[PDB]
Design a protein around this motif. Structure first.
Motif, PDB file in Angstrom:
ATOM      1  N   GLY A  25       0.836  -1.188   0.000  1.00 18.30           N
ATOM      2  CA  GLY A  25       0.000   0.000   0.000  1.00 18.30           C
ATOM      3  C   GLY A  25       0.869   1.235   0.000  1.00 18.30           C
ATOM      4  O   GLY A  25       2.102   1.150  -0.001  1.00 18.30           O
ATOM      5  N   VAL A  26       0.209   2.397  -0.041  1.00 19.73           N
ATOM      6  CA  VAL A  26       0.943   3.659   0.036  1.00 19.73           C
ATOM      7  C   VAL A  26       1.323   3.961   1.487  1.00 19.73           C
ATOM      8  O   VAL A  26       2.437   4.408   1.768  1.00 19.73           O
ATOM      9  N   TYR A  27       0.412   3.729   2.432  1.00 21.46           N
ATOM     10  CA  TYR A  27       0.654   4.022   3.854  1.00 21.46           C
ATOM     11  C   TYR A  27       1.053   5.488   4.080  1.00 21.46           C
ATOM     12  O   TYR A  27       1.947   5.797   4.873  1.00 21.46           O
ATOM     13  N   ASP A  28       0.374   6.410   3.389  1.00 20.27           N
ATOM     14  CA  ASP A  28       0.576   7.836   3.625  1.00 20.27           C
ATOM     15  C   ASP A  28      -0.168   8.261   4.895  1.00 20.27           C
ATOM     16  O   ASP A  28      -1.292   7.820   5.149  1.00 20.27           O
ATOM     17  N   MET A  29       0.490   9.072   5.728  1.00 24.71           N
ATOM     18  CA  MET A  29      -0.077   9.587   6.981  1.00 24.71           C
ATOM     19  C   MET A  29      -0.812   8.492   7.761  1.00 24.71           C
ATOM     20  O   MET A  29      -2.018   8.548   7.974  1.00 24.71           O
ATOM     21  N   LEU A  30      -0.033   7.509   8.211  1.00 29.04           N
ATOM     22  CA  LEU A  30      -0.592   6.299   8.806  1.00 29.04           C
ATOM     23  C   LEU A  30      -1.526   6.614   9.975  1.00 29.04           C
ATOM     24  O   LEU A  30      -1.180   7.392  10.872  1.00 29.04           O
ATOM     25  N   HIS A  31      -2.702   5.978   9.984  1.00 30.89           N
ATOM     26  CA  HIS A  31      -3.694   6.180  11.036  1.00 30.89           C
ATOM     27  C   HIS A  31      -4.289   4.829  11.438  1.00 30.89           C
ATOM     28  O   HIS A  31      -3.935   3.775  10.895  1.00 30.89           O
ATOM     29  N   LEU A  32      -5.202   4.879  12.418  1.00 34.22           N
ATOM     30  CA  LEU A  32      -5.812   3.676  12.975  1.00 34.22           C
ATOM     31  C   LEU A  32      -6.350   2.753  11.891  1.00 34.22           C
ATOM     32  O   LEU A  32      -6.332   1.522  12.051  1.00 34.22           O
ATOM     33  N   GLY A  33      -6.808   3.325  10.775  1.00 36.80           N
ATOM     34  CA  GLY A  33      -7.327   2.512   9.685  1.00 36.80           C
ATOM     35  C   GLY A  33      -6.283   1.595   9.077  1.00 36.80           C
ATOM     36  O   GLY A  33      -6.535   0.404   8.876  1.00 36.80           O
TER      37      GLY A  33
ATOM     38  N   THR B 141       4.859   1.547  -1.471  1.00 35.98           N
ATOM     39  CA  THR B 141       4.973   1.950  -2.870  1.00 35.98           C
ATOM     40  C   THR B 141       5.870   3.181  -3.028  1.00 35.98           C
ATOM     41  O   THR B 141       5.930   4.055  -2.154  1.00 35.98           O
ATOM     42  N   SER B 142       6.570   3.242  -4.164  1.00 39.57           N
ATOM     43  CA  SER B 142       7.512   4.319  -4.416  1.00 39.57           C
ATOM     44  C   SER B 142       6.768   5.633  -4.640  1.00 39.57           C
ATOM     45  O   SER B 142       5.576   5.649  -4.962  1.00 39.57           O
TER      46      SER B 142
ATOM     47  N   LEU C 131       2.200   8.776 -10.223  1.00 36.73           N
ATOM     48  CA  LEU C 131       1.813   8.524 -11.608  1.00 36.73           C
ATOM     49  C   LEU C 131       0.484   7.787 -11.695  1.00 36.73           C
ATOM     50  O   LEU C 131      -0.341   8.094 -12.557  1.00 36.73           O
ATOM     51  N   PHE C 132       0.260   6.817 -10.808  1.00 41.42           N
ATOM     52  CA  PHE C 132      -0.841   5.865 -10.916  1.00 41.42           C
ATOM     53  C   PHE C 132      -2.020   6.185 -10.004  1.00 41.42           C
ATOM     54  O   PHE C 132      -3.171   6.031 -10.420  1.00 41.42           O
TER      55      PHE C 132
ATOM     56  N   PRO D  94      11.390   0.483  -1.683  1.00 42.47           N
ATOM     57  CA  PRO D  94      10.031   0.440  -2.223  1.00 42.47           C
ATOM     58  C   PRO D  94       9.645  -0.967  -2.669  1.00 42.47           C
ATOM     59  O   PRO D  94      10.515  -1.819  -2.780  1.00 42.47           O
ATOM     60  N   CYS D  95       8.362  -1.199  -2.907  1.00 42.60           N
ATOM     61  CA  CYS D  95       7.852  -2.447  -3.448  1.00 42.60           C
ATOM     62  C   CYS D  95       7.372  -2.239  -4.885  1.00 42.60           C
ATOM     63  O   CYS D  95       7.042  -1.118  -5.287  1.00 42.60           O
ATOM     64  N   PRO D  96       7.300  -3.297  -5.682  1.00 44.81           N
ATOM     65  CA  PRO D  96       6.700  -3.152  -7.007  1.00 44.81           C
ATOM     66  C   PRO D  96       5.257  -2.698  -6.876  1.00 44.81           C
ATOM     67  O   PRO D  96       4.559  -3.029  -5.910  1.00 44.81           O
ATOM     68  N   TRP D  97       4.823  -1.913  -7.864  1.00 40.77           N
ATOM     69  CA  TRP D  97       3.435  -1.471  -7.928  1.00 40.77           C
ATOM     70  C   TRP D  97       2.476  -2.641  -8.158  1.00 40.77           C
ATOM     71  O   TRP D  97       1.388  -2.678  -7.578  1.00 40.77           O
ATOM     72  N   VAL D  98       2.842  -3.597  -9.010  1.00 39.71           N
ATOM     73  CA  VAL D  98       1.997  -4.755  -9.289  1.00 39.71           C
ATOM     74  C   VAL D  98       2.700  -6.016  -8.809  1.00 39.71           C
ATOM     75  O   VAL D  98       3.881  -6.230  -9.117  1.00 39.71           O
ATOM     76  N   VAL D  99       1.957  -6.866  -8.092  1.00 41.97           N
ATOM     77  CA  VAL D  99       2.469  -8.150  -7.621  1.00 41.97           C
ATOM     78  C   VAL D  99       2.527  -9.144  -8.775  1.00 41.97           C
ATOM     79  O   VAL D  99       1.578  -9.263  -9.557  1.00 41.97           O
TER      80      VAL D  99
END
Lengths: 130, 130
Positions: B9-17, B39-40, B46-47, B74-79
């Motif tokens: 995931g992106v995990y931007d501004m990580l919160h309880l969710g 993700t990078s 871009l995506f 970073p991880c690949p965008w697509v598994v």
């Protein structure tokens, strides 16, 4: 060998700054139990001013942090010698009301990390829109 | 007995969710290793569109979450199937591009939690000032 460490705070909108401080308290000694005290809504508002998240919200977030072993929620606003005895606390971790803790050898300093905070982050968003 | 779980995931501004979702992936089986892929910057922009924190910031926060055992950043965008083999991943945790993972029995659903987010929280602050 196990040392009980107590850290207390508001922990509103937890960010990397809180987490690093928690990590630091947890790693003061080789074998520790980190107890975290989370301040009540009413007392934070009365004494510090405004809290954004409720006691339950701030406590539930803390539950997910690696370094946290136990939580006291809510915790007393002021630490007492009785309180330390009750919970068998060896050291209080903190970043003079605390003179008595230093005198007893129970005061452990931890540092802050500026710039990492939730507040600072929305600023970042807004600079985008000039 | 140990099962390797992958969540990305992106995990931007990580919160309880995010944290609850991570907890859920971590507890899919009794004995797991949760690997988290972050993700990078370039590919998220871009995506998906806009990221607030950098790759290093989003990864360093994740480091402090209890449920996270390993991070790929970073991880690949697509598994890909190759990717699963490379890291000996047994299941991919997620909340049709993923048809192939379901077909292989490697798809594990996790749920979201609405309302808990950083965005929603500054709204809370502003309702104060009408």
């Amino acid at each position: 060998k196990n040392v009980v460490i107590y850290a207390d705070g508001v922990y509103d909108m937890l960010h990397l700054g809180h987490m690093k401080q928690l990590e630091q308290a947890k790693k003061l000694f080789e074998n520790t139990t980190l107890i975290v005290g989370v301040t009540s809504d009413n007392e934070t508002k009365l004494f510090k001013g405004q809290v954004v998240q409720t006691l339950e919200e701030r406590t539930e977030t803390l539950k997910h942090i690696r370094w946290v072993d136990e939580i006291i929620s809510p915790c007393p606003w002021v630490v007492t010698p009785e309180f330390l005895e009750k919970y068998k606390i060896d050291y209080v971790a903190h970043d003079d009301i605390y003179a008595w803790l230093k005198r007893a050898g129970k005061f452990k300093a931890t540092q802050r990390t500026e710039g990492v905070s939730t507040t600072d982050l929305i600023v970042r968003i807004l600079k985008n829109y000039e």
